Amino acid sequence: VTNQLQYLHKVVMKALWKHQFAWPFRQPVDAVKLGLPDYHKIIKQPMDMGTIKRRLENNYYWAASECMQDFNTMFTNCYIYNKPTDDIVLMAQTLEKIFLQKVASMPQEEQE
Amino acid sequence: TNQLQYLHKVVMKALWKHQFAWPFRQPVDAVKLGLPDYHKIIKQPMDMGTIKRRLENNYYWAASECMQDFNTMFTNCYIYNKPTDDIVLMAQTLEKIFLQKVASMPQEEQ
Ligand SMILES: Nc1nc2c(ncn2COCCO)c(=O)[nH]1
Ligand SMILES: Nc1nc2c(ncn2COCCO)c(=O)[nH]1
């Protein structure tokens, strides 16, 4: 497995998964459960930490950059769809700041 | 530091020249662009011109802190604009390059 995907699993996902703001992102947006009949109109590429976490457990990723894009798509989905004033937006912002400051310490290069 | 230099000369380099970069090279001008609610909604304006100047003037103490400014700039765009505005596509494209360039950053400190 890659040095960088190992960092993404054990440092980034470990931090973000147990975070007190993580729960709205731990599973796919369920448009029916949440009452969002336009969600899949607006968000064409849904993403969530459950999917990323399993994808790290199943070595589905080839490069770290593609794990990073899933994280980024997840947060971007949230800012695009939700209202500027929704608490979910500031939860995503808080989680994204951690993702970014962890990524600033990720190795370079590749392995495996 | 080595990482700030990389963010200056590799990351900011690539993004500045990009064909979608022009809305992001200078602060949003809410009055010229016709957006009287822009500052009611975005409380932390940010833009690559401000980030470039801060890197030239040694404003940043750490890499993560310049990376946060890049993120704020993109997030502002996503939060303020309608999902279908082209500028959202432009920010996503730029942000993807940003993440990919950041993954190859020297891991140290300097
Ligand atoms: N579904 C749901 N779970 C929550 C809420 N607050 C905390 N949790 C549990 O997740 C926190 C991590 O254990 C909440 O408001 N709703
Ligand atoms: N109430 C609540 N909002 C959520 C949840 N998951 C997603 N959202 C709404 O944000 C969608 C952004 O892509 C969740 O389980 N709790």
- Name all contacts of A81-87 with Cβ < 8 Å and 24+ positions apart: A81/A36, A81/A39, A81/A42, A81/A43, A81/B83, A84/B41, A84/B79, A84/B80
Three-state DSSP class for residue B12: helix
* Locus of tokens 């996902």: A13
What single letter denotes the amino acid at residue A3? N
* Domain assignments of chain A as residue spans, ordered by start: 3-104
B101: CB partners within 8 A, 6+ apart: B10, B11, B14, B15
Taking the mean position of all CA atoms in its chain, how far away is CA A95? 9
Taking the mean position of all CA atoms in its chain, how far away is CA B56? 15
> Are the CB atoms for A110 and A63 separated by under 8 Å?
yes
- Give the architecture-level CATH label for domain A3-104: Up-down Bundle (1.20)
The best mutation among A17, A20, A23 to test binding of ligand 1, ranked by most ligand atoms within 8 Å of the C-beta, falls on: A23
CA of B82 to the centre of ligand 2 (A): 19
Q: Which of B9, B103, B98, B2 is nearest to B52 (CA)?
A: B9
DSSP 8-state code for residue B38: H
User: A 21-40 residues with CB below 8 A of B?
Assistant: none
> Are the CB atoms for B38 and B81 separated by under 8 Å?
no
> Are the CB atoms for B23 and B48 separated by under 8 Å?
no
What single letter denotes the amino acid at residue B58? N
A38: CB partners within 8 A, 6+ apart: none
* Locus of tokens 């199943």: A58
Q: Which ligand is nearest to the CA of A23?
A: 1
Cβ neighbour number for residue B96 with a 10 Å cutoff? 15
d(CA A76, CA A101) in angstroms, rounded, equals 17
Residue of A79, A97, A103 with shortest CB distance to B102: A103
Q: Which of B19, B24, B9 is nearest to B105 (CA)?
A: B9
* Experimental method, per PDB record: X-ray
- Residue with CA closest to ligand 2 atom 13: A78
> Are the CB atoms for B105 and A104 separated by under 8 Å?
yes
E strand spans, chain B: none
Q: What is the 3-state secondary structure (H, E, C) of A27-78?
A: CCCCHHHHCCCCHHHHCCCCCCHHHHHHHHHCCCCCCHHHHHHHHHHHHHHH
Q: Which tokens is A57 given?
A: 């457990």
Q: Which tokens is B13 given?
A: 């380099």
d(CA B105, CA B102) in angstroms, rounded, equals 5
d(CA B89, CA A83) in angstroms, rounded, equals 18
- Give the architecture-level CATH label for domain B2-103: Up-down Bundle (1.20)
